[PDB]
Amino acid sequence: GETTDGVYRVMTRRLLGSTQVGVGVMQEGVFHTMWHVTKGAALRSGEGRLDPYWGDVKQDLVSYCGPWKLDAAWDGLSEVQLLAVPPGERAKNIQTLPGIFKTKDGDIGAVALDYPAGTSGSPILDKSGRVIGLYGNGVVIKNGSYVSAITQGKRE
């Protein structure tokens, strides 16, 4: 199937009609998404099949066809862009200055952007166009809004 670099919708026909369950990134022949989008299940790409290769529930990440390839990191200073791919709608770039998740094991960039469930896995980009993490694992805060970590894997 198609393996061109880019952003992809993750779809299913198990429910009524076709439903977008998430989003992911194809880079260097590897498909990258958030664990909770696929639960680590095999995927179809056209006539081909993508098998899971690496994943971790706690990081909430999974890669298909090879190891995690995305290694860019937020510089902690500059605005970034969410390349949001909402269900039934065209891909769109939203620019923002990340906040910070403060944890016992260090700080993580976080974006205060609120998109529906089907957009989990959408990439967050730096100004060079490199993917610095995926959108869709985060917190609901008091004001009802959603704040997503900038979740990035490790390239071995």
Binding site: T38, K58, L113, V139
Partner: protein
């Protein structure tokens, strides 16, 4: 059974809509990969 469909290139857009604030939150990450707010 899930399938993927291409939705575009991954590129920075020069004149993108700017939105969102920059909250600084203390969070905890549990073994199930869920974030929670600590206070």
């Amino acid at each position: 059974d899930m399938y993927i469909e291409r939705a575009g290139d991954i590129t920075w857009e020069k004149d993108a809509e700017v939105t969102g604030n920059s909250p600084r939150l203390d969070v905890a990450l549990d073994e199930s990969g869920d974030f929670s707010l600590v206070e």
